[PDB]
Ligand SMILES: CC(=O)c1ccc(N2CCN(C(=O)c3ccc4c(c3)OCO4)CC2)cc1
């Protein structure tokens with residue numbers, strides 16, 4: 001298919017994330033290749049190479065078409081594409097489970113594989129609910145979180161997303177009614193944690209779990225909070241006998257400057273979700289880990305099992321690429337790499353603070369954000385960035401990037417320069 | 430890892446579908462290769478080849494490691510592993526969307542890609558709910574189905590699963606309360622449809638949709654029903670203004686003897702889900718299709734968009750191998766192939782009718798079932814079949830197979846022989 005043919009098929013037949021059919025302000029851009037940190041996009045009938053500043057929605061941590069990951073896929077393909085995980089096991093699942101147990105926060109001893117982040121969050125909730133039913137406390141069935149969060153698009157996951165950003169006004173009488181604490185602040189304030197505890201105290205008998213994104217909240221607003229809050233959550237959850245669940249689907253595998261964001265606080269949750277960067281951005285895969293105590297309590301309960309089982313559970317191909325991606329990350333000095341990335345983002349974004357439409361500039365690991373004083377028009381921002389050799393996709397009032405770890409210092413500065421130019425244009429209306 | 434090491438890691442750290450940790454009656458069997466219709470499994474420390482009678486849970490319709498499908502994946506890998514679908518489109522998505530719109534029942538004009546069957550079901554429900562909210566009818570928010578069904582493991586999907594099979598007794602006060610009609614019978618009885626209609630009529634003002642598996646109910650009991658019931662559902666839904674959703678995640682792509690099971694009834698749903706065999710069993714991928722009317726009504730609604738967007742939406746690698754798989758199916762006389770397979774299953778399983786513990790033997794396309802009068806002990810059945818060179822996994826009182834379309838008559842004879850002998854063992858006590 002030619003690019004124009006693709007565009008025609010697309011406009012008539014393809015849904016995109018959070019999109020319409022037939023009412024799109026702008027056509028999507030045709031992508032025809034991806035290699036390293038670079039996408040090849042069709043612009044005015046001509047191929048152009050631009051930097052993947054979004055890492056293709058947090059996934060492409062090693063860049064596209066990495067030789068080690070390509071080879072891991074084709075090597076596995078030669079022996080076994082897939083087998084059903086009911087009654088069978090295999091080397092890629094065992095290797096990946098062993099790795100994940102080893103590198104995640106202490107005490108996370110069992111691994112449930114699934115095919116997406118949203119599913120992994122629903123598995124986490126199911127573990128928490130079956131846990132308390134295994135303890136004879138089925139009343140413990142609600143979830144508590146703070147505002148500003150995002151946990152996926154399936155209906156349970158939706159119920160703990162930020163009610164405003166998640167448009168819960170459209171889902172009246174449909175979603176489970178969960179417990180929301182106020183937005184967690186950037187700076188540490190003991191009064192916030194005290195109020196969180198006072199609120200949780202009133203609901204402890206009906207709460208299965210607290211579910212949060214640690215340190216960085218992604219889709220709900222690219223907000224950062226002090227890791228000390230996670231220490232307080234762990235303490236509150238321990239004392240009130242409420243499970244703690246960390247959703248690390250966006251924060252995992254080095255992205256915030258620690259291997260997992262929980263590590264910024266030294267905290268172990270009872271249950272943890274990972275996903276977006278798990279395969280290095282090749283294939284859909286997610287995992288939900290839980291403690292031995294949670295696993296044993298479920299297994300001794302009435303069902304005698306965790307009542308969940310995806311068709312493609314522990315897919316050999318996805319597991320094999322994931323093993324290679326995790327090993328590639330661990331086999332290099334990733335902490336220095338991310339520290340350098342963060343320094344590049346900080347240095348490159350500093351000039352934005354003085355722009356008239358910019359309210360905040362913030363960086364956390366390989367994440368850089370310009371917060372503007374008005375919603376960003378994509379019809380202006382996307383081509384403006386493409387004109388500067390960069391693929392950027394703003395959301396709401398945010399111009400942000402989460403670049404591949406393999407970006408050179410020069411590439412990071414090209415990304416930040418495009419971000420600054422987009423912000424400058426926002427202030428030009 | 431050696432097979433012994435894999436078993437050690439697996440027992441300590443890996444969840445399996447609907448399994449325990451630490452309380453498994455039997456260790457999983459190590460799988461070390463898969464090629465064509467055959468798995469290589471470790472038995473007594475040795476690699477043994479056995480037939481994949483389950484198609485690895487409906488997925489492996491062309492067998493494992495099909496050269497055409499291996500090739501499609503390898504080809505795409507060299508060009509583009511993945512890009513984000515937010516703001517970008519690409520050739521594999523366009524090619525697959527065009528194929529799917531063309532070969533599915535008439536009127537299904539738009540395609541929403543996701544990463545699993547359960548997610549695709551939640552997307553279908555979301556489409557239905559946003560549709561009626563787009564028509565100013567937010568009260569139309571419940572689902573209706575018949576008993577015996579299975580629609581996945583996320584919490585909305587659970588709510589329309591059979592209450593017994595789905596263990597809803599363990600989920601009191603957690604699941605949405607949906608409307609259930611009685612078990613749909615095997616033989617056509619207009620009285621059943623009239624009763625379904627009368628029940629639906631009473632609830633029409635609060636129902637968004639009817640959701641059913643067409644012709645074959647899979648995980649809920651491997652039950653078949655007359656396609657004429659689907660013709661009745663289409664009629665009822667039309668007259669009472671309730672959307673019709675067909676879950677073809679197990680029935681799709683030729684498995685029941687028609688390209689889609691809906692085709693047996695000559696009826697189109699408003700929304701349709703596909704999944705398990707979409708990539709020919711290589712990779713996680715699912716799709717939700719809907720009519721132009723549904724898409725436009727959602728897009729004109731208050732959201733202006735379908736509020737869903739998976740990270741790996743329309744993954745190039747998965748779409749590329751799916752295109753190859755679908756083209757491989759369509760480029761052959763698949764209808765004759767399935768007819769030969771059904772004939773082979775019938776011929777091979779007929780002798781089981783005389784066995785003292787057998788209550789029914791039924792075949793539908795490339796699906797063969799022996800139903801017994803008592804539970805099938807997995808500890809006896811699995812090695813009994815392995816000893817005869819076949820991988821079979823009974824469930825409850827059912828001994829069944831859904832073999833790869835590429836199985837030779839000799840291989841179907843081998844599979845059915847193993848099934849008959851498993852049933853013989855059940856009645857021996
Ligand atoms: C991938 C794989 O091997 C695999 C996947 C799933 C699997 N299952 C085996 C176990 N099972 C069920 O107990 C089941 C769950 C919910 C239901 C149901 C049956 O019918 C109505 O609602 C169905 C799921 C068994 C094996």
Ligand SMILES: CC(=O)c1ccc(N2CCN(C(=O)c3ccc4c(c3)OCO4)CC2)cc1
Pocket residue numbers: 017018057148149150151161162165166167219220221395513514515516738739740741742
């Ligand atoms: C894969 C891809 O390109 C992609 C995927 C998702 C995507 N999104 C862009 C659109 N969006 C949202 O409207 C959103 C939904 C629910 C929320 C939320 C934000 O914050 C609190 O709860 C966040 C998801 C944008 C692009």
Ligand SMILES: *Cc1c(COP(=O)(O)O)cnc(C)c1O
Pocket residue numbers: 116117118119121150151152153213218219247248249250275276738739740741
């Ligand atoms: C992206 C994301 C999810 C959802 O994952 P999908 O793969 O899109 O279903 C859940 N939680 C968080 C924190 C995420 O960033």
Ligand SMILES: *Cc1c(COP(=O)(O)O)cnc(C)c1O
Pocket residue numbers: 309310311312545546547548550579580581582642647648676677678679704705
């Ligand atoms: C297997 C199945 C599902 C769920 O698919 P997953 O990929 O396991 O989430 C949903 N509906 C039907 C009819 C199925 O057979």
